[PDB]
Amino acid sequence: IVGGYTCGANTVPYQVSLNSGYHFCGGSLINSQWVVSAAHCYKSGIQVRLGEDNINVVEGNEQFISASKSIVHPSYNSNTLNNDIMLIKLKSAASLNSRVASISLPTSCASAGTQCLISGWGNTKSSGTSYPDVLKCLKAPILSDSSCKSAYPGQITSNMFCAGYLEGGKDSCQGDSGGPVVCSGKLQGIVSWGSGCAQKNKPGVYTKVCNYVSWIKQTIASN
Numbered sequence: 250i251v252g253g254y255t256c257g258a259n260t261v262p263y264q265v266s267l268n269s270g271y272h273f274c275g276g277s278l279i280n281s282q283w284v285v286s287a288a289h290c291y292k293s294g295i296q297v298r299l300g301e302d303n304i305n306v307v308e309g310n311e312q313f314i315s316a317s318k319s320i321v322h323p324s325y326n327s328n329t330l331n332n333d334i335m336l337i338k339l340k341s342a343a344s345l346n347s348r349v350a351s352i353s354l355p356t357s358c359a360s361a362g363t364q365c366l367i368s369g370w371g372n373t374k375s376s377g378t379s380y381p382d383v384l385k386c387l388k389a390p391i392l393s394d395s396s397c398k399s400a401y402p403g404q405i406t407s408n409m410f411c412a413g414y415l416e417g418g419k420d421s422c423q424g425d426s427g428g429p430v431v432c433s434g435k436l437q438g439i440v441s442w443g444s445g446c447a448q449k450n451k452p453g454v455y456t457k458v459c460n461y462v463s464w465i466k467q468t469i470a471s472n
């Protein structure tokens with residue numbers, strides 16, 4: 250997260266870190282056994298880390314649970330990043346509490362202008378590289394489809410939306426990938442892509458979660 254703020258320990262209880270010996274992506278807990286992340290975060294050997302603040306220190310509220318299965322969206326295209334969504338099932342159900350909690354799926358899509366909370370452990374620099382160890386947060390509005398398409402000609406599909414600031418300086422970044430965009434208590438987006446980070450006229454692009462609720466529910470119901 251570039252130009253954000255320190256969330257505070259366990260203030261974003263649905264935020265998970267995906268770990269393969271190191272943090273590599275964010276995710277969102279959507280029930281006791283399932284996490285939503287980005288398809289471009291797919292790899293084998295995933296451990297889901299819940300209840301994290303400082304990802305380099307055991308602080309007492311963590312649950313570390315290995316993934317039993319991961320399911321990339323059937324229509325994910327790694328070239329275009331269309332359908333950039335995946336589900337990860339935990340080998341055992343997380344113990345849900347005030348600091349480890351699921352986030353609700355949308356019942357309808359969010360509109361341009363809606364304010365959302367974006368979070369993660371990604372790079373905090375727009376030029377250069379600095380990884381924080383505590384969770385960072387950014388409040389950002391969803392942008393209109395037309396401004397999103399104008400920002401990224403030929404690249405925005407019906408499964409993507411832009412959020413952030415066209416002036417630059419405030420954005421998600423590398424390492425925030427797969428993490429949440431939550432608006433009015435609903436998971437509306439997944440950190441997907443962007444040109445650099447926090448660059449003028451290059452806002453963050455996010456997977457449009459409301460398009461996938463039927464797939465998520467049906468997949469969970471049979472796996």
Ligand SMILES: [Ca+2]
Pocket residue numbers: 301302303304305306307308311
């Ligand atoms: Ca920790």
